[PDB]
């Protein structure tokens, strides 16, 4: 074992969510597959899936944490309710705006619905922005695209 | 979550780096300091005394004790080292010649090398050539010592340097004394050292004028303490010319003089369990260790209490002799000790000879899965086959791993058991670690629950590869590899055509049978040492496996000119050969 580099790139939560759900689909681990084969009826095809308990725990936990909504309301994340073209649209929208890579990552990872959340993510917003930019942040993020 | 990633990379030994243990390396690897001469305490009915030569913290010598360092038993403990601090340093018998040589190269007054600067640079340049071998290095070191001996006066101090040598070169304690004759190469030049020497000797004969006859025999003695203190103030840059690498912290010459004696683990010096009595006898190394501890304690007591210098030097010499005999037994006469005749067994005795570690347990050793039996002929056996008794095949087992191809066969073998011939003696489950004997179990539920990873030790069957050997091994064809057959007559049987490479005659010859226990070894044996692949001796390429006597004669009689056969006899002959 030898870590060539600590960081090779960045991954948005859409990337990890899509990769993990593709892993569930390929390994037959989703709630649909288990509720169709192991539950709700007896197995006749005997379609045993890939077996890895630690990977079960970690992937199930991560997909549950990314599926649930974030700290913006007191029902789902919205990342699970948006596609690749919506992500492309969102980054084409966000590229022209005065944001850094880390800030764009954080706002696409969390998708704020609250004004105070947006001022929490970006640093010294009043020293860079004016009120119309914050407003337009709110409708571009609220559209989930 | 809470555990870190554990990684393991397989590794092999790239090479050894021999050195000498320093004092810090001896103490750091130690576990307990030996500070008594008593092995046992009588209030616990002969238990190992704490801080003794026998000690739990070193290890265990019996199956019922605990190590108290790894808390293992006899069969799972590697043993641990103790250390013992001698009251006064003594010479190492192994490094004694090296000590004399390194004393021949340094100044006996200021502890500096006896070489001019340009010659030192030239010799250092000649040592560091990028293709220096052991022979060239030894030659250059010998030339360096010759040049050092040829020096007369030190280049850093006006001190006359004589010749350094042994005392008497006998079997006694004089073998471990070093003398330095200062005024050997003095001539008549009247060095100031000669003036000082004659002044001191006139002064000492002013009081005792009977030592004049002993003046000529007095040279500068080099006791181990003076030698240690002289080595300690040597220059580090001078160590390379003496053949020692000083980059490592243990590269000083001071490491080659006994200051700390490492007490060996009791695993390598096991006390004898019983000898026709409950009492336990001790190995000679442990007795010598107790003697060394007693002598060191006695020397320390004499030093800090105040005893005549004759007795102190006598006990110093006795300690040196005891350590030397503890290392090498035949280096000194045992009668020179006050205690003593059977010579003791030292480490050098344990490492040398036909029964030493190198030629008795490392180059070759006794092996498992082997059998020795008288041989008898069998012409109806193929040349690549040897017949094994079933009474041997029931004992010698081959460990076969269960696969998808032989599951039914191994299940049947397990069902058969260890009494009938085609069967098994032991079964080892995949997840378990200790083999379960295939004699006390049900032998049926074990067969039904035979996993695909278990290892079953089946009986030696037909078609199995066995090494077959005759003990005088002159050439490589003395050991061959045959296919096993099973026959019930208590003797190994091999075809007579294979008799010639073995040089075996059926007149009471006992031959050996080895069974390899791994697939790689079995394949290599059958495809390199097989009888078919070794019909030719490599000495000249001629056949050596061929028709021996009584096969040549019958073949000649059949092929005689005046022998004729009709259809019946010819057909019978053809039927007998196939």
């Amino acid at each position: 074992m030898k870590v060539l580099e600590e960081r090779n790139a960045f991954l948005s939560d859409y990337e990890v969510l899509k990769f993990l759900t593709d892993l569930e689909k390929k390994h037959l681990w989703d709630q649909k597959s288990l509720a169709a084969l192991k539950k709700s009826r007896s197995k006749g095809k005997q379609n045993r899936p890939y077996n890895h308990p630690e990977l079960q725990g970690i992937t199930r936990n991560v997909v549950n944490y990314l599926s649930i909504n974030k700290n913006f309301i007191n029902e789902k994340s919205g990342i699970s309710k948006m596609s690749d073209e919506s992500f492309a649209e969102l980054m084409t929208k966000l590229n022209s705006f005065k944001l850094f890579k880390a800030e764009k990552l954080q706002i696409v990872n969390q998708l704020p619905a609250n004004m105070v959340h947006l001022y929490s993510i970006v640093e010294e917003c009043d020293a860079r922005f004016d009120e119309k930019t914050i407003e337009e942040m709110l409708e571009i993020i609220s559209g989930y695209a | 979550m809470k555990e870190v990633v554990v990684s393991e990379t397989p590794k092999r030994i790239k090479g050894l780096e021999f050195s000498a243990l320093s004092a810090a390396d001896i103490v750091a690897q130690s576990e307990v300091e030996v500070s008594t001469r008593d092995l046992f305490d009588l209030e616990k009915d002969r238990a190992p005394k704490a801080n003794g030569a026998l000690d739990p913290k070193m290890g265990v010598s019996s199956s019922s004790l605990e190590c108290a360092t790894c808390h293992g038993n006899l069969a799972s403990c590697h043993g641990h080292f103790g250390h013992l601090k001698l009251a006064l340093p003594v010479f190492h018998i192994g490094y004694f010649k090296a000590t004399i040589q390194i004393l021949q190269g340094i100044c006996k007054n200021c502890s500096a090398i006896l070489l001019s600067e340009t010659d030192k640079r030239q010799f250092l340049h000649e040592l560091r050539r990028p293709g220096v071998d052991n022979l060239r290095r030894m030659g250059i070191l010998k030339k360096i010592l010759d040049q050092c001996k040829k020096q007369r006066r030190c280049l850093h101090c006006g001190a006359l340097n004589g010749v350094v040598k042994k005392a008497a070169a006998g079997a006694g304690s004089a073998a471990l004394k070093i003398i330095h004759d200062t005024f050997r190469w003095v001539g008549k030049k009247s060095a100031p050292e000669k003036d000082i020497w004659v002044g001191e000797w006139k002064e000492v004969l002013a009081h005792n004028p009977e030592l004049e006859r002993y003046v000529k025999r007095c040279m500068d003695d080099l006791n181990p303490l003076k030698t240690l203190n002289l080595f300690k103030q040597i220059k580090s840059a001078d160590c390379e010319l003496l053949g020692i690498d000083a980059t490592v912290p243990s590269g000083r010459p001071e490491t080659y003089i006994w200051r700390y004696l490492p007490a060996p683990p009791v695993c390598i010096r096991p006390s004898v369990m019983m000898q026709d009595s409950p009492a336990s006898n001790e190995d000679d190394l442990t007795v010598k260790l107790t003697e060394i501890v007693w002598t060191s304690s006695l020397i320390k007591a004499g030093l800090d209490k105040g005893i005549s210098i004759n007795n102190m030097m006598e006990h110093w010499d006795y300690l040196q002799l005891t350590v030397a005999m503890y290392i090498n037994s035949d280096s000194v006469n045992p009668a020179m000790l006050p205690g003593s005749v059977k010579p003791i067994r030292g480490f050098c005795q344990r490492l040398k000879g036909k029964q030493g570690r190198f030629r008795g347990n490392l180059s070759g050793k006794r092996v498992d899965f082997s059998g020795r039996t008288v041989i008898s002929p069998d012409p109806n056996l193929s040349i690549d086959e040897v017949a094994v008794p079933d009474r041997v095949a029931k004992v010698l087992t081959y460990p076969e791993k269960v696969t998808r191809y032989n599951r039914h066969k191994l299940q049947e073998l397990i069902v058969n058991g260890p009494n009938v011939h085609p069967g098994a003696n032991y079964l080892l489950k995949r997840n378990e670690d200790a083999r379960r004997n295939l004699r006390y179990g049900d032998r049926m539920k074990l067969a039904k629950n035979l996993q695909i990873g278990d290892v079953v030790e089946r009986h030696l069957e037909d078609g199995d590869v066995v090494l077959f050997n005759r003990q005088p091994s002159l050439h490589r064809l003395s050991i061959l590899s045959h296919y096993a057959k099973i026959r019930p007559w208590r003797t190994f049987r091999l075809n007579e055509c294979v008799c010639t490479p073995y040089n075996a005659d059926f007149d009471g010859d006992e031959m050996n049978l080895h069974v390899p226990q791994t697939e790689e070894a079995r394949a290599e044996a059958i495809n390199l040492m097989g009888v078919k692949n070794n019909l030719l001796t490599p000495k000249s390429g001629e056949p050596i496996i061929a028709a021996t006597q009584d096969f040549i004669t019958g073949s000649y009689l059949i092929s005689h000119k005046d022998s004729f056969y009709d259809r019946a006899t010819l057909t019978q002959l053809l039927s007998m050969m196939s």
């Binding site: 880390a102 010294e124 | 001469r37 501890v293 007693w294 007591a301 209490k305 105040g306 007795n311 205690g339």
Partner: protein
């Protein structure tokens, strides 16, 4: 046996301990209390060591996040001071093979560390 013979001054009970301590017991007469003159000496030694440590001749080595944000801006700079090549070496005191590593044509400067006669040590 081998235990039988003992010298004149020793007894049968004194032997056998073999206890040699690894710690010394004889101190040199140099461990006395501090006085004011050696106090000033220690101050001067500490000042010299501190002066050499941060100087242009030090090779002690035998943050650092690739991501950039606005809080990373308006931060204290690196504040580099007196590198190896800045010192004006006399070219005649060095071998020719050492010229290339040091700056021979680079703009050069020399730093001076002020000396404090007062005790900079708390105690």
């Amino acid at each position: 046996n081998y235990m039988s013979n003992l010298p004149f001054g020793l007894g049968y009970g004194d032997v056998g301990k073999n206890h040699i301590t690894e710690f010394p017991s004889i101190p040199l007469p140099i461990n006395g209390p501090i006085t004011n003159k050696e106090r000033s000496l220690a101050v001067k030694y500490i000042n010299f060591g501190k002066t050499v440590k941060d100087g242009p001749f030090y090779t002690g080595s035998m943050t650092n996040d690739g991501i950039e944000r606005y809080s990373d801006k308006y931060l204290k700079k690196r504040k580099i001071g007196i590198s190896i090549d800045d010192h004006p070496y006399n070219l005649n005191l060095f071998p020719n093979e050492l010229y290339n590593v040091m700056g021979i044509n680079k703009k050069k400067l020399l730093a001076i560390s002020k000396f404090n006669n007062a005790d900079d040590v708390f105690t």
